[PDB]
Design an enzyme around this catalytic site. Structure first.
Site, PDB file in Angstrom:
ATOM      1  N   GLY A  29       0.807  -1.203   0.000  1.00  0.00           N
ATOM      2  CA  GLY A  29       0.000   0.000   0.000  1.00  0.00           C
ATOM      3  C   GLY A  29       0.843   1.258   0.000  1.00  0.00           C
ATOM      4  O   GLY A  29       1.858   1.325  -0.699  1.00  0.00           O
TER       5      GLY A  29
ATOM      6  N   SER B 199      -0.504  -5.224  -5.594  1.00  0.00           N
ATOM      7  CA  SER B 199      -1.057  -5.023  -6.928  1.00  0.00           C
ATOM      8  C   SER B 199      -0.990  -6.295  -7.761  1.00  0.00           C
ATOM      9  O   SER B 199      -1.916  -6.587  -8.525  1.00  0.00           O
ATOM     10  CB  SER B 199      -0.317  -3.889  -7.635  1.00  0.00           C
ATOM     11  OG  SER B 199       1.030  -4.249  -7.887  1.00  0.00           O
TER      12      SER B 199
END
Lengths: 240, 220, 250, 204, 240, 232
Positions: B47, B129
């Site tokens: 993050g 991701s």
């Protein structure tokens, strides 16, 4: 004696006299007794008329805390009024946070810890009150509690608070209270009051009898003794 | 960003990568994403990078405060309770995606923490991701109670699937092996990507830059 | 309550102060500190307490506290109370530099402390500071300076001052031997070692019982030199040599 | 954006026993310059510098707040500050304004106070530390500065070639930028001395 | 000596003493009570008498055994009002451990936090320092059973055989003669010495209905208060 | 509450603080201790005797770590010690949260002594009755400090707090030197604790912690039994 000024100080032998001084201020108040049968709790208060101008029902010592909980205070009357409003306020928050009636075993713990907090600091003094707590339920039966000015709170079958604390419980314990009904108790409470010094060296008095149990369906209210007047008719026959 | 974890028959193997980007430009070719918590617990971060760094240092400071006052080894469920109670108070403003793993007296425990405060106990998790690519390697090839080198081969395979997806890495596959007694930590475990050689002459001359004003200040 | 409180705030019937006069006498039963101006410098001297042979002295400075960049201070009185004032005073001099980006000009730093030290004699029932302390420094506007803090909050700009009931005879000596106008560093160091020869009753002036720090404005730097114990030795023997001239007259 | 309101470019580069840092000189609002003597490199102790780039308010603000905390650190302790210690100090100062953040990206370059070991790092606008071994860059024209440093950097370089590499990297990249220029100052430090040079750049 | 107000508040006297806390050490002794805890085995036993002077006084509302959590029980000596308020903190902060940290509190960690609350009442003035005493038991995994004891001064320790109340100096002298040949403590050797110490210090040889027994054991780690029938089973078992 | 806010300490007419001098008397009547700074380590030792044969020894410790290279002992009264220990734990982590680096032992004593200063000046509270000995090997050289309930601190080579400290002060002066090894320093640290101990000294009567450069370490009774195994 000397160090006995604050409530936050100890004696050289290890007790607090400010708690000891406030206990025998309850001793000078008139006698209020409490008793429970197998399906209810019956209160009773010897209350004396001040001079004549009392208006027959003022400044009573039989309070009403909850739907099923009331008090039988004795001692400083003004100090008991402020303490009764704490128990009214404490039972309201239990309703608003949990949705049902307060148990008497939990209610007496919340009050006695509040009385305990005034016995620790030098800014405030201990209370000068002692009182009774009686209730009735269908899942718990009848209970009867007892709170001193120090904060010790546990259960009895019968008690007395006032001058004749010892002189009343001598003849309470000669009753078969485990199996009587609380309609037969009411005519037996009134003779306990009238034996020990109702108007002998005092001037006058008036009897108050509070009442809770199975016949009231859990409600707490004063007796309908005004109706048929049977308490005084049965107790005044004990003159000989 | 691709992080993953697994629980084999004796402990927990964690894996991560070594790229942090700004926009669509590679900012760092070697970044550490496996953070220290306790001598039995580690945590992978995903993050916002500064949100994960300042969070993983505070809780690691509280457990050092807790265990030294207690006098025994910490628990993974204690670090689980501190993180999800802190992140719920910020209402998801702090963007932190964490994989928590360690070995207690009760055994190994693996968790996955979302930035709103929802936690899941799972035998294998992926975050980041490229978590979609690494998860497909697990479900195809996970079996319960694997061995040591069998579990290490699965994680380095699963991280490399995210590296050859976009937002991969400059390629230094990291591993942290946590067992009941032995603790391993391997930064250059696998280098699959190499930079090619420079085939041109770039001879910088001693004096090929004009200088307006010089200044000399000695020291001691 | 009421019977448990201390006074700390109540005038005398004649008008004097009851607690402030007591704190100004405990400093006299403490260490010795002094300073002296020069035409191109300023210096400080100090007395070592607790010179027992099982200590470390790893701080390189005990009485002296280099406070901003171009100022330092000695200290006297309660050592436990003294650490609160120094951490505040470095913090006063540093928020000034955040505000103007110019160093603090050596006077309104002192008045900033002397308002804090005053305020415990006024409102609030609290114990006043039992610390008097010196000041050295340099500014753009006046140059080399000495100041004299007090528990009352009074300050004075002195040319050569010291501590009282410990070393009150030094002030009588400094009026006799400090000549006005020329007061340079080699003349001021030899004057300082002469004074501590009498006040400290230890004979021969053992170098482990003293401490000397100086300040010279040098090429736009204002260095603060806490001179080491090796060159204290030959500074003593220079004064020890002066006894040989002192016996030639008899 | 807010970062593109005044421009700027700060580059640091690690050598063999030395380290160099460089910045531009142009100060200005969005399209109008004001002056060519705006300081963006500030000394924080000897053999240890810092460079700031971004919004010109937060450049002058953080450099005074960091100087406020450095002098209080170097008086409670007689030692000087280590280069790892300053990076933790700046990252604390930026993270306190987590949601009111300063608009700058610091670059720290310097040597070890005991050994000769160089150190370079850069931070984000909220305090993410990032140490490297070759170079760090910050400012508006960042992508042009990566194109020059990836091709010209050599591992072990004397202070002669290190100066010539960071000179050609700054001149060719900032001349491609529009809102940066008007002069480049270069600091090159080492164990023995500190050398400051200014370069002859395009003044358009 | 009495210097300043050392005999009244919590300040230092000459010779480093302070009297308002060591007056609280014999604030326990007005209870007229004695409690004994014994650790010998994979179990742990509390034993403490009750004193019922009145037939109107109940039986279930006399118990000094208090259940803190499911695995931790305690007994209270000293005055009654300070005792029950001390347990309200112990029930409260045992649940804060479960909420903040996610597992069950150790018995060693809880006795620290209780004694740290009694610290500030000694440290700060105008705050009465809770003249009561607490003894804990519980099971720790990979550590066996433990017995802890807290003081009004804030001092705690853990030890194997415990006396409290009035008669420590006679009971602890009996248990050192008992625990010097470390025999096989087999969960009835523990209960028998827990009775025969108190049955000889008080020297009563008492009826089955004046004591309580709290127990915890490695098998069933729940806190457990014994029944009057099975109290009588252990009492006639030592009739040899 | 009311908010009384008045301190219990004022000056004497002679100029001394009376209650601080009374608190040092409770320090001198505590359990004895000794700390010796050697050439490669710092040795701490103390006197831990129970009043009965019932008291467990694995419950309460005397040598107590602060960080993994800093320990801390005491001589005074028991329960006041655990306050400033937990205070020093939370204080030492705040240095680590800012600077990402373990705290030096000089900087820790700068702040722990300020905490003990604050209870002497503020309102209605009493000063501590515990003096300390703070140790640690940071940046090559090891350190050994001592803080008093007044709020000051010192820097010792070898010292002794507790009962009979004037006898141990002369004994350490007649036995210590410029340098020893750490293994020689523990030998002269029990022999100064054997001066004031009782008739028996076992693995559970004393309690010893050390400070190597590898970090802080307190000793299990296996080593302490093997160390006093006929080597004095």
């Amino acid at each position: 004696t000397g160090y006995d000024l604050s409530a936050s100080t100890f004696s050289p032998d290890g007790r607090v006299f400010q708690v000891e001084y406030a206990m025998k201020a309850v001793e000078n108040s008139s006698t209020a007794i409490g008793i429970r049968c197998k399906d209810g709790v019956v209160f009773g208060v010897e209350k004396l008329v001040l001079s004549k101008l009392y208006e027959e029902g003022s400044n009573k010592r039989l309070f009403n805390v909850d739907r099923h909980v009331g008090m039988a205070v004795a001692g400083l009357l003004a100090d008991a009024r402020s303490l009764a409003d704490i128990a009214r306020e404490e039972a309201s928050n239990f309703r608003s946070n949990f949705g049902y009636n307060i148990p008497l075993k939990h209610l007496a713990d919340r009050v006695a810890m509040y009385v305990h907090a005034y016995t620790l600091y030098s800014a405030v003094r201990p209370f000068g009150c002692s009182f009774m707590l009686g209730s009735y339920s269908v899942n718990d039966g009848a209970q009867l509690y007892m709170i001193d000015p120090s904060g010790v709170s546990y259960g009895y079958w019968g008690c007395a608070i006032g001058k004749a604390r010892q002189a009343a419980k001598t003849e309470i314990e000669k009753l078969q209270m485990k199996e009587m009904t609380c309609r037969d108790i009411v005519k037996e409470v009134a003779k306990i009051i009238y034996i020990v010094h109702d108007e002998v060296k005092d001037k006058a008095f008036e009897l108050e009898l509070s009442w809770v149990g199975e016949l009231t369906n859990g409600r707490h209210e004063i007796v309908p003794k005004d109706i048929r007047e049977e308490a005084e008719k049965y107790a005044k026959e004990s003159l000989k | 960003t691709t992080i993953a974890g697994v629980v084999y028959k004796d402990g927990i193997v964690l894996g991560a990568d070594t790229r942090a980007t700004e926009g669509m430009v590679v900012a760092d070719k070697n970044c550490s994403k496996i953070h220290f918590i306790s001598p039995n617990i580690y945590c992978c971060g995903a993050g916002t990078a500064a949100d994960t760094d300042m969070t993983t240092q505070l809780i690691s400071s509280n457990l050092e405060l807790h265990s030294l006052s207690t006098g025994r080894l910490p628990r993974v469920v204690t670090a689980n309770r501190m993180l999800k109670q802190m992140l719920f108070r910020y209402q998801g403003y702090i963007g932190a995606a964490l994989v928590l793993g360690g070995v207690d007296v009760t055994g190994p425990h693996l968790y996955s923490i979302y930035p709103h405060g929802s936690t899941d106990k799972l035998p294998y998790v992926t975050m980041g991701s490229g978590s979609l690519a690494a998860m497909a390697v697990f479900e195809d090839k996970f079996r319960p109670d694997m061995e040591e080198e069998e579990a290490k081969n699965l994680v380095s395979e699963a991280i490399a699937a995210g590296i050859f997806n976009d937002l991969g890495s400059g390629s230094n596959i990291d591993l942290c092996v946590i067992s009941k007694n032995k603790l391993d930590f391997l930064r250059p475990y696998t280098v699959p990507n190499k930079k090619g050689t420079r085939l041109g002459r770039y001879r910088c001359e001693k004096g090929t830059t004009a200088v307006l004003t010089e200044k000399i200040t000695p020291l001691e | 309550s009421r019977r448990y409180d201390s006074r700390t705030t109540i005038f005398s019937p004649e008008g004097r102060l009851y607690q402030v006069e007591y704190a100004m006498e405990a400093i006299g039963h403490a260490g010795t500190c002094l300073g002296i101006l020069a035409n191109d410098g300023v210096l400080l001297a100090a007395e070592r307490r607790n010179i027992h042979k099982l200590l470390d002295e790893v701080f390189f400075s005990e009485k002296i506290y280099k406070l901003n960049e171009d100022m330092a201070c000695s200290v006297a009185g309660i050592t436990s109370d003294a650490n609160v004032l120094t951490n505040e005073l470095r913090l006063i001099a540093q928020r000034y530099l955040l505000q103007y980006q110019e160093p603090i000009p050596c006077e309104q730093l002192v008045t900033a402390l002397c308002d804090i030290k005053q305020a415990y004699t006024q409102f609030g029932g609290k114990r006043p500071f039992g610390v008097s302390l010196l000041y050295i420094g340099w500014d753009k506007h006046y140059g080399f300076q000495l100041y004299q803090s007090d528990p009352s909050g009074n300050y004075g700009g002195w040319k050569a001052t010291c501590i009282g009931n410990n070393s009150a005879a030094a002030v009588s000596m400094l009026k006799q031997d400090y000549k006005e106008g020329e007061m340079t560093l080699k003349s001021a160091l030899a004057l300082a070692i002469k004074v501590l020869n009498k006040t400290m009753d230890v004979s021969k002036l053992s170098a482990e019982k003293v401490e000397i720090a100086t300040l010279t404005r040098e090429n736009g730097k204002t260095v603060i030199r806490v001179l080491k114990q090796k060159e204290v030795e030959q500074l003593i023997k220079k004064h020890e040599e002066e006894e040989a001239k002192a016996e030639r007259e008899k | 954006s807010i970062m593109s309101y005044n421009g700027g470019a700060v580059m640091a580069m690690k050598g063999k026993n030395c380290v160099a840092i460089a910045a531009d000189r142009r100060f200005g609002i969005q399209a109008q310059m004001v002056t060519t003597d705006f300081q963006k490199i500030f000394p924080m102790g000897d053999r240890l510098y810092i460079g700031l780039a971004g919004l010109a308010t937060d450049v002058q603000t953080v450099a005074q707040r960091l100087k406020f905390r450095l002098n209080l650190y170097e008086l409670k302790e007689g030692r000087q500050i280590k280069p790892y210690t300053l990076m933790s100090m700046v990252a604390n100062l930026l993270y306190e304004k987590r949601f009111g953040p300063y608009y700058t990206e610091p670059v720290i370059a310097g040597l070890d106070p005991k050994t000769f070991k160089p150190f370079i790092c850069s931070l984000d606008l909220i305090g993410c530390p990032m140490v490297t071994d070759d170079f760090v860059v910050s400012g508006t024209c960042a992508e042009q500065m990566y194109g020059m440093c990836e091709s010209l950097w050599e591992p072990n370089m004397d202070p002669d070639h290190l100066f010539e590499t960071i000179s050609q990297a700054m001149l060719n990249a900032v001349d491609r930028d529009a809102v940066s220029g008007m002069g480049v100052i270069v600091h090159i430090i080492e164990k023995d001395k500190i050398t400051t040079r200014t370069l002859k750049a395009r003044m358009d | 000596s009495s210097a300043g107000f050392d005999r009244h508040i919590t300040i230092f006297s000459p010779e480093g003493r302070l009297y308002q806390v060591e007056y609280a050490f014999k604030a326990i002794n007005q209870g007229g009570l004695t409690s004994v805890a014994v650790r010998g085995k994979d179990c742990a036993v509390i034993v403490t008498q009750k004193k019922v002077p009145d037939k109107l006084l109940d039986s279930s509302t006399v118990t000094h055994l208090f259940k803190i959590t499911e695995n931790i029980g305690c007994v209270m000596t000293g005055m009654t009002a300070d005792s029950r308020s001390q347990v309200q903190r112990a029930r409260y902060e045992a649940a804060n451990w479960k909420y903040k940290y996610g597992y069950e509190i150790p018995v060693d960690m809880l006795c620290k936090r209780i004694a740290d609350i009694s610290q500030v009442y000694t440290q700060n003035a105008e705050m009465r320092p809770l003249g009561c005493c607490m003894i804990l038991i519980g099971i720790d995994e990979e550590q066996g059973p433990q017995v802890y004891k807290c003081d009004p001064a804030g001092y705690y320790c853990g030890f194997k055989a415990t006396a409290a109340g009035v008669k420590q100096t006679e009971s602890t002298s009996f248990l050192e003669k008992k625990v010097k040949k470390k025999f096989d403590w087999t969960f009835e050797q523990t209960v028998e010495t827990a009775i025969t110490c108190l049955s000889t210090v008080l020297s009563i040889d008492f009826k089955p209905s004046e004591i309580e027994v709290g127990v915890v054991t490695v098998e069933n780690p729940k806190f457990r208060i014994l029944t009057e029938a099975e109290i009588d089973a252990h009492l006639v078992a030592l009739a040899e | 509450e009311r908010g009384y806010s008045f301190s219990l300490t004022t000056f004497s007419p002679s100029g001394k603080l009376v209650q601080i001098e009374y608190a040092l008397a409770a320090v001198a009547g505590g359990a004895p201790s000794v700390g010796i700074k050697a050439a490669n380590g710092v040795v701490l030792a103390t006197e831990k005797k129970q009043k009965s044969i019932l008291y467990d020894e694995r419950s309460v410790h005397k040598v107590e770590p602060i960080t993994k290279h800093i320990g801390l002992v005491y001589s005074g009264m028991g329960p006041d010690y655990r306050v400033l220990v937990h205070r020093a734990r939370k204080l030492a982590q705040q240095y680590y949260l800012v600077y990402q680096e373990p705290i030096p032992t000089a900087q820790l004593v700068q702040r722990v002594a300020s905490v003990m200063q604050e209870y002497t000046q503020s309102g209605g509270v009493r000063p501590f009755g515990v003096s300390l000995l703070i140790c640690g090997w940071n940046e090559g050289r090891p350190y050994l400090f001592q803080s008093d309930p007044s709020g000051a601190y010192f820097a010792w080579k070898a010292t002794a707090m507790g009962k009979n400290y004037v006898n141990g002060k002369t004994f350490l002066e007649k036995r210590y030197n410029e340098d020893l090894e750490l293994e020689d320093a523990i030998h002269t640290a029990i022999l100064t604790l054997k001066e004031s101990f009782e008739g028996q000294m076992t693995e559970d009567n004393i309690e010893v912690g050390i400070c190597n450069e590898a970090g802080f370490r307190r000793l299990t009774p296996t080593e302490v039994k093997d160390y006093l195994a006929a080597i004095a």
